[PDB]
Amino acid sequence: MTETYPVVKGAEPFFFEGNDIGILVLHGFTGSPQSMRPLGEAYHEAGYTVCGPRLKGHGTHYEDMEKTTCQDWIDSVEAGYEWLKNRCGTIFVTGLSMGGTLTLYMAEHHPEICGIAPINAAINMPALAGALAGVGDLPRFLDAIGSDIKKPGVKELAYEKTPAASIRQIVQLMERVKTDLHKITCPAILFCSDEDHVVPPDNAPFIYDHIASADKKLVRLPDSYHVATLDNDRQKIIDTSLAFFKKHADRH
Template identity: 25%
Template sequence: MSGLLTPTAAARALSFRLKGSLGKAVLLLHGMTGAPGEMKFLAKRLHRRGFSVAAPLLAGHGTDEKALLASDWRDWLGSAREAFAALQADHDEVYVAGICVGGALGLALAAEEPAVAGAAVYSMTYRYDGWNMRRWYSAVTPLAKPFAGLPLLRRISFVEPYPFGLKDERLREGMAATQGAVIPGALDRVPLGAMHEMHRLADHIDRVGRDVTQPALILHARDDDMSHPRNAERLGKVLGGPVDLRLLDDCYHMIHVDKQRDLVGDITADFFGAPPRAGEARAGASADA
């Protein structure tokens, strides 16, 4: 971990923070190979509801595959831990919310830090077993875990397949046109070594889940193209505190940027105790338990 948490030029350029009016803050954690920019839609929605928000760049992210492979899930958690401490210094309550690996990191932080007021997890992924994933991958990946950390195998990488976790046609065509380079600092390939760290983090959540006694919101798309809703159901059974699990009906894996992103923001704000806003539009979106 040495040196990985030292602020880099990428971290300074890509991380962001907005000051709110409630005295409450939300730490927003991007996904594996992602970057803080993917959290901006959610950040703006939460900020409009009064929350301060901070979206740090996770250690090893924001530059290239080599830097990512030099980090592990504990380094990523260290980034979340530092950002949480900074928010805690000037806010009465601090919550965590994250997509996929970011959500798991938020839970890992909540397990070790009782001061985390609550957590929201979007599109939890134990396995890539959604409808757009090759069937053999879900079965083979757990068997490959003992070998995925080997130097040669770690560098093997996979391109994220179309539709890139997006049901919104405009967004996914933009991703296709730019070969995934829409979010500054995000990578368009996933190294096997990083996948290995994702699985190690998921195993950690299974071990410490009972220590997460804070309220947890789990949001997942019914038609998630990357991770089946059974991933969310499994997570709900692991956690030690009250769980609110909801399935969304008009988006894919990237629920925080897809067609129901405003709904995701509003459900999260409500769950974290934001006062209701008169006339807040929610037409055209729905969710159910």
């Protein structure tokens, strides 16, 4: 596909020059880099080189999104990875929701990745998969309202509709990332909201159980809902991820 709409203000990808340690920061499904930008600025302020990419058909119009595949989303992630690889010998990947899924995908295909930090990563979503047995009975565009965030008054740049055709794209990505988890050896910290109205809570331990990593931990986000990067536990995510980055950078 090709995007007919322009990037919405605030949805731009961020590229931060820094030292030889890079961080790849990924947003989720119908989202944009706006939800990841606070993490990205924080990691940049710590001296790190940072890339938050814009996934294709994201941050423009959901009509654009409708035409994208999950391979398009991977391409967008891989392009950001490659940008980092030209500037950095050490690269970590972190992402929210489907960005966490893509974070796991990257660890599944690129052994040189030093560590990962998915946030509320989705590998199993019965509701969506259920909607697929249907899908001819679904509206072309589902109303997607609003963002799942506990902290009141918070606004996320994300689409107000989900294309029904994008559902099979995210399901196909989750299925593929699910079966491939055993391939992951790198250090992993899995952030999981206590209450998440979007991704089932059993996703986090499931991921924990099927990756082959020797150094792995689940980290609870007790005051936050699904979009945790804009939520109460935002700082906890940042501080924990910085400590994680430093720790493994020091040990290589």
